[PDB]
Curated annotation (Swiss-Prot):
The gene is TP53. Changing K69E: In sporadic cancers; somatic mutation. It comes from Homo sapiens (Human). This is Cellular tumor antigen p53. Changing V48E: In sporadic cancers; somatic mutation. Changing P155S: In sporadic cancers; somatic mutation. Changing S165A: In sporadic cancers; somatic mutation. Changing R114T: In sporadic cancers; somatic mutation.
Length: 195
């Protein structure tokens, strides 16, 4: 009834990477290693790097899923709020209820789990472009952390899993997410609070 969040590199040495975008007021997406937390604006591009030590097999996929970070909310499905699920902003592929979208990948598949009712989005794992050392997936988060009737100011985690063609686990990584109007300011504030 709750997805595992345990970091697991597995046989291929799977882990995530993030750009260094800084904390200027104008920044739209920024990652805090000290907090393991991504701060981003609504529906803006969030580049996430996929690193392995060796190439996994053809048919390997990469899934993203959100869960609530607090234990007392973790069995609740993370979904878009009653406003945003009705604002008709679909890309023609993502169901309007899904918080997490993949941008610019026509092979993205969106799952509503028949047993758990959780949402996820999965894409084929592709090797890096010639000249690149990793593959980047572009995610969008489609509600604010503060949306009433949705996340309702509750923190979430994104869990990224590397899966074989059957959906079996090959690797797992995760990060906290705050979707907010001013990611740069909020990252600076939370990093200072931590210090
Ligand atoms: C990373 C999964 C993948 C995609 C496309 C081709 C290959 C080969 C060859 C190994 N693995 C692959
Ligand atoms: C997970 C995405 C992905 C698929 C296949 C290969 C890679 C690499 C490296 C692995 C070591 N040799 C160069 C590509 C980073 N990321 C990958
Ligand atoms: Zn919302």
């Amino acid at each position: 009834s709750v997805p595992s969040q345990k970091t697991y590199q597995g046989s291929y040495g799977f882990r995530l990477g993030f750009l260094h975008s800084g904390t200027a007021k104008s920044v739209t997406c920024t990652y805090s290693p000290a907090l393991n937390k991504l701060f981003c604006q609504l529906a803006k591009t969030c580049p996430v790097q996929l690193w392995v030590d060796s190439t996994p097999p053809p048919g390997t996929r990469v899934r993203a899923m959100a869960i609530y970070k607090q234990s007392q909310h973790m069995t609740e499905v993370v979904r878009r709020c009653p406003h945003h699920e009705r604002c008709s902003d679909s890309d023609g592929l993502a169901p309007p209820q899904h918080l997490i979208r993949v941008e610019g990948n026509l092979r993205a598949e969106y799952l509503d789990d028949r047993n758990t009712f959780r949402h996820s989005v999965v894409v084929p794992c592709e090797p890096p472009e010639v000249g690149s050392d990793c593959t980047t997936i572009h995610y969008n988060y489609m509600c604010y952390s503060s949306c009433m009737g949705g996340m309702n100011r509750r923190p979430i985690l994104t869990i990224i899993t590397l899966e074989d063609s059957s959906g079996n686990l090959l690797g797992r990584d995760s990060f906290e997410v705050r979707v907010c109007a001013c990611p740069g300011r909020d990252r600076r504030t939370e990093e200072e609070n931590l210090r």
